[PDB]
Design a protein around this nucleic acid. Structure first.
Lengths: 119, 120, 96, 452
RNA sequence: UUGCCGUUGCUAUGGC
RNA sequence: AUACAGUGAAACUGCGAACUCAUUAAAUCAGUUAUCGUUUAUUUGAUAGUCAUGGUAUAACUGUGGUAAUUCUAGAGCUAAUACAUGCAAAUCUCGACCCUUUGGAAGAGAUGUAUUUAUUAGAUGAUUCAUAAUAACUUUUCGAAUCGCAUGGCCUUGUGCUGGCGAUGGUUCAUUCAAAUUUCUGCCCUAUCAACUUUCGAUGGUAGGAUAGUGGCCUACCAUGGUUUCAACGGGUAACGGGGAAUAAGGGUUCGAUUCCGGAGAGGGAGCCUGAGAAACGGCUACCACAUCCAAGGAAGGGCAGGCUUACCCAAUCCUAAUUCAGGGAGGUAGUGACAAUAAAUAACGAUACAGGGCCCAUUCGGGUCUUGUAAUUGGAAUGAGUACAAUGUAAAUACCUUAACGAGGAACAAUUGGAGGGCAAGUCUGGUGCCAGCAGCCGCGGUAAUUCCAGCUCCAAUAGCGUAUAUU
């Protein structure tokens, strides 16, 4: 819920760990009509394939969930994702400081707490 | 923090898309971006620029007739946006007669008719 | 022209006495691989009979070239009869 | 928050906010089940023999070969009639089989197959290129670990699989592309699977016993010069001018990308805080120390030790082979005044380092060998903490361009005898850029090393 | 040990 | 199969069968208790000593008939039970004198189901009149296997004696589980243009009883009198299709989705009743009231939902219910008709030759600016999508999807639209005139419909699977 993608991108810079990119052509939704798969789509597809390979069953498309997915995710991918990169992240009104703020335990309210943090 | 993190994110993904250069990593350069910068990333334009086609219309015809394969898969949409990692791998499909495959139906009919004429 | 078969996640289930494995069937310049010929191939690989071998759930990748599915190999034909469902027995022709 | 941390730089603020973000997610955020599932169902370096080796007392035997420009050598060693073989491919379109079993004696030629101009196809239509022989130069060769087959590939855009006994082709496999020249071949260890790296930015995987192609992987901005693979189904490729090293998961068609990113200005600043720094132009050769570590040689002489967990190299040995000799002062200018000639030498700027043309790491071990046209192979030992390597020894027997280095073992577990075979040629296997190297003969260089 | 040549052994390595 | 023995219709037996219309703010709901205040079909764990085998009454089934007739009926004849009815002193212990002889054998003295109702008497828990054990009785009073299939058991006593193992279905009480009923405290709108409410179905308690599965004014006698509160008791409005972090979320919509509880009542309408572990039953029965159907006019039976201004396939998945693996499920899944809002393409791409000397831009005109352009001219091979169509995959089956051989273009007739601007023509027509003009216009001319190849199909512009008009409005 508090995961945000600009944060994830800066963490992916500051890690120094390689990030397991896929091959060049495997990312394309069918013949370029859907486009390049976004990172969230690839992660979800990996999770579904792991689930199917574990249970030895392939999920039939439920009517309501499939209709909701085709109405929402495909339209959002066409509107925001441009060549595998989504730009609706900047049009969104969510706030980074809500996640980046300490907001709870170890918020350093006490002056002696600040002194202990300095020490 | 909003400016720091989202400006860095926006600049990085614009670079990965390819409309923004590697040395042009500023928000004012993001502002100075224009429509033609995105239009040069179209697969029709990219095929023409790489020189697989003699024109943009020939490039569109090649793409819609499925000779062009970007990476592993054949792309048949001329409006496919091409990234920095993909622009080197744009090439003719293996199934295409232009790159490494059997000739098409026109050449096969012509060759069969010529063979029938030679037999006659 | 020969098809290639890669078996992954091979798990032995002694309660059913089955071998359960994900099958990656790699097929250049071929449409897809028939299940009967594939049962022959896995039967010869695992040294069990075709009647013991069972495959299902094949999904073909975009652009062809790879079909991923699930495969069960039994130890006995009669045990495959008594554990296998009637619809897959009809598909395989083993039972009416 | 901002008032407390107002003194921070922008990058410092980014770091502290990333730290607070990670702490918030760790605050906001079956194993036995996975274990008992896996019960119903990758190795480090195990052999440590760098310190035990004696190198100065090792013999050096350089055997001449009539072929021009021996591009590659591949050695077959049996795995427990016990014979050890080698196969050498040259630019003279010739594949030669040798027996290397007796370590004391020179390698003995058994037979040879020479392609010629008669193997040029008449159709040239990119799928009729199935001729039995090679019509263009052969760059690389590999020997299948079971021992029945040897695979040759080169600039003729085909892979020819030969039976070892008759040295005759049992299969020819076109790459089916106008642009793809097979630069490097690597067999998966104790497997029939072959990974070929082509110049059309591809890595093709074949199963040789079935003579089929499993899949092709598309990853590089430039040509894929070298590929190396250990026992598990994965490989490491290097491209030349993209300056990346790629670790490919073969079944998952995914890749880890490693980029050097060295800055000579930064190195000069580091030295000033504490010389010639040549920026890296291309990565040529790669080898796998184990399943977590691989080592790459570049054209600026850099030998880099890489781990899978770190994008940057762990270690870098710069100008490992040396700096090329200064150009002749009477040749460079052509004026009468020798002071003008010395000025036109322009000092240290025209100096260029040696390129690591070959590099082999003995698998699951700390010893690796680097070869260039300096006239000396170099043997290096990786430290036990695996962060760095040092130079154990220098083998000065071979003179010329070292195109390919292989090591074979024949001894007891207490006492192992290692034979190092390098295919020495007068020219680089890719091109004729390197000029007039002094005293270079085409041949096979063998060094036999015994541990203490 | 080399396509050829030369030297050294009768095996070592200089040239093309 | 010389009792039956395989598979089994019918029947008996057993188990299950627990959509519409109205709007309440301590009510509901949400949690939280309590049940030392209660009921149990099932599951699970315990639990019972106190005739080699009893008597019937019927169904299905035979037959004889009545009715216009119903799942309607009467008379006569049959036989079964895990149906119904009936029904059986020994053994184990304690105290064992004494004997030997220590473990031991024994003179003897004594004891001994369960349930129901009540009176009396003595191990748990913080706590009991609770558990349990007694004593005297009581009961339209029970329960303490007359059952079934797989094995043919081990003895010697070869008696055809003794008794031999795995399982079914029963049955008693207690516990458990599944529920449920009450109960506890904690929480939800506006308002005094709403200050008294309750005894106006008893209001607040006490005693006794009735009732219930059980506490209880739940009800009934008798007896006291109370209980709630301007801190808003109480009342009104609430659009209360409401609210509940109830609910998975919102994996970067500004607060949005999705799920769940709505609360109650009814199943032509009032009322009474019944079966079950669980219903005041979406079942049935009686009377009453209103509809309505068939009839031979004597009688007989019945209870709506979708549509306008409804189907097919299936238990394969998911899960549940039966004597049960198997059966069944309009739970549940799948498919079909259903442009609408809106999608990604295509309707051609490269050339070659010939011929011509003009093409375009600006400007009121006068004019000016510019330079490889024009052609309904010919011609060449290449490419492939729509389609046609083989298979496999896919699924209970099929469709669809994925993959996919074989065919698939010159008028590429494999025939794109929609709107706008401007001409020109006749032995033609109409109108106005100061000859020969001006205007309106012109599918209509003079012959001709196999008749004619004609401004060659008159030129130009724009959007393009879209594109106009009308009205309203910024």
């Amino acid at each position: 819920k508090s995961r945000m993608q600009a944060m994830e991108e800066y963490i992916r810079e500051s890690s120094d760990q390689p990030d397991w990119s896929a091959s060049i052509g495997a990312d394309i939704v069918n013949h370029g009509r859907g486009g390049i798969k976004s990172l969230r789509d690839t992660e979800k597809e990996r999770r579904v394939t792991s689930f199917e390979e574990d249970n030895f069953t392939r999920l039939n498309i439920t009517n309501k969930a499939e209709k909701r997915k085709q109405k929402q995710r495909e339209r959002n991918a066409r509107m925001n994702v441009i060549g595998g990169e989504d730009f609706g992240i900047f049009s969104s009104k969510r706030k980074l400081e809500d996640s980046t703020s300490r907001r709870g335990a170890k918020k350093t309210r006490s002056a002696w707490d600040r002194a202990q943090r300095r020490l | 923090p909003k400016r720091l993190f989202e400006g860095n994110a926006l600049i990085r993904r614009l670079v990965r898309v390819g409309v923004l250069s590697e040395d042009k990593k500023k928000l004012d350069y993001v502002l100075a971006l224009k429509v033609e910068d995105f239009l040069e990333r179209r697969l029709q334009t990219q095929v023409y620029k790489l020189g697989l086609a003699k024109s943009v219309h020939h490039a569109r015809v090649l793409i819609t007739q499925r000779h062009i394969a970007v990476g592993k898969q054949i792309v048949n949409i001329p409006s496919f946006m091409v990234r920095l990692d993909s622009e080197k791998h744009i090439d003719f499909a293996p199934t295409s007669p232009f790159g490494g495959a059997r000739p098409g139906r026109v050449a096969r009919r012509n060759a069969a008719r010529k063979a029938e004429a030679s037999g006659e | 022209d020969a098809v290639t078969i890669r078996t992954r996640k091979v798990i032995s289930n002694p309660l059913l006495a089955r071998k359960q494995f994900v099958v990656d069937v790699l097929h250049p310049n071929r449409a897809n691989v028939s299940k009967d010929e594939l049962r022959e191939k896995l039967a010869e690989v695992y040294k069990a009979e075709k009647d013991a071998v069972s495959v299902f759930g094949f999904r073909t990748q975009f652009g062809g070239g790879k079909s991923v599915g699930f495969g069960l190999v039994y130890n006995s034909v009669a045990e495959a009869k008594k554990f296998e469902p009637t619809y897959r027995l009809v598909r395989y022709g083993l039972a009416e | 928050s901002e008032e407390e941390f107002e003194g921070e730089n922008p990058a410092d603020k980014r770091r502290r906010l990333a730290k607070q973000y990670l702490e918030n997610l760790k605050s906001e955020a079956g194993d036995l089940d996975k274990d008992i599932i896996a019960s119903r169902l990758q190795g480090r370096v195990f052999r440590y023999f760098g310190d035990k080796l004696l190198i100065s007392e090792a013999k050096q035997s350089f055997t001449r070969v009539g072929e021009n420009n021996l591009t590659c050598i591949s050695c077959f060693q049996p795995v427990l009639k016990g014979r050890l073989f080698a196969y050498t491919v040259s630019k003279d379109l010739q594949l030669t089989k040798y027996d290397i079993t007796d370590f004391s004696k020179r390698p003995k030629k058994l037979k040879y197959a020479k392609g010629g101009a008669k193997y040029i196809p008449t159709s040239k239509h990119e799928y009729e290129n199935t001729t039995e022989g090679h019509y263009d130069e052969i760059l690389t060769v590999a020997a299948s670990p079971d021992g029945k087959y040897v695979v040759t590939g080169g600039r003729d855009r085909k892979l020819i699989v030969w039976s070892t006994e008759s040295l005759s082709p049992v299969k020819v496999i076109p790459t089916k592309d106008r642009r793809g020249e097979v630069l490097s071949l690597a067999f998966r260890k104790n497997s029939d699977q072959l990974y070929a790296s082509c110049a059309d930015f591809k890595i093709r995987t074949y199963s040789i016993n079935q003579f089929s192609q499993l899949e092709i992987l598309y990853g590089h901005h430039d040509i894929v010069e070298d590929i190396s693979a250990l026992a598990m189904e994965r490989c490491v490729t290097v491209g030349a001018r993209d300056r990346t090293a790629m670790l490919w998961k073969i079944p998952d068609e995914t890749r880890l990308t490693f980029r050097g990113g060295d800055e000579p200005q930064k190195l000069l600043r580091r030295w000033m805080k504490e010389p010639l720094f040549f920026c890296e132009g291309s990565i040529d050769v790669v080898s796998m120390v184990d399943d977590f570590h691989f080592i790459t040689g570049s054209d600026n002489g850099n030998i880099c030790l890489w781990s899978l967990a770190k994008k940057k190299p762990i270690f870098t040995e710069r100008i490992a082979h040396g700096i090329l000799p200064e150009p002749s002062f009477n040749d460079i200018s052509g004026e009468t005044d020798e002071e003008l000639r010395k000025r036109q030498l322009q000092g240290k700027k025209l100096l260029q380092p040696f390129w690591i043309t070959s590099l082999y790491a003995i698998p699951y071990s700390n010893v690796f060998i680097s070869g260039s046209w300096s006239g000396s192979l170099k043997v290096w030992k990786i430290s036990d903490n695996l962060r760095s390597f040092e130079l154990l020894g220098e083998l000065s027997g071979a003179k010329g361009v070292v195109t390919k280095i292989q090591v074979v073992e024949s001894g007891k577990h207490g006492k192992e005898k290692f034979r190092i075979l390098a295919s020495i040629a007068k020219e680089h296997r890719l091109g004729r850029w390197i000029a007039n190297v002094s005293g270079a003969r085409n041949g096979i260089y063998s060094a036999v090393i015994d541990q203490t």
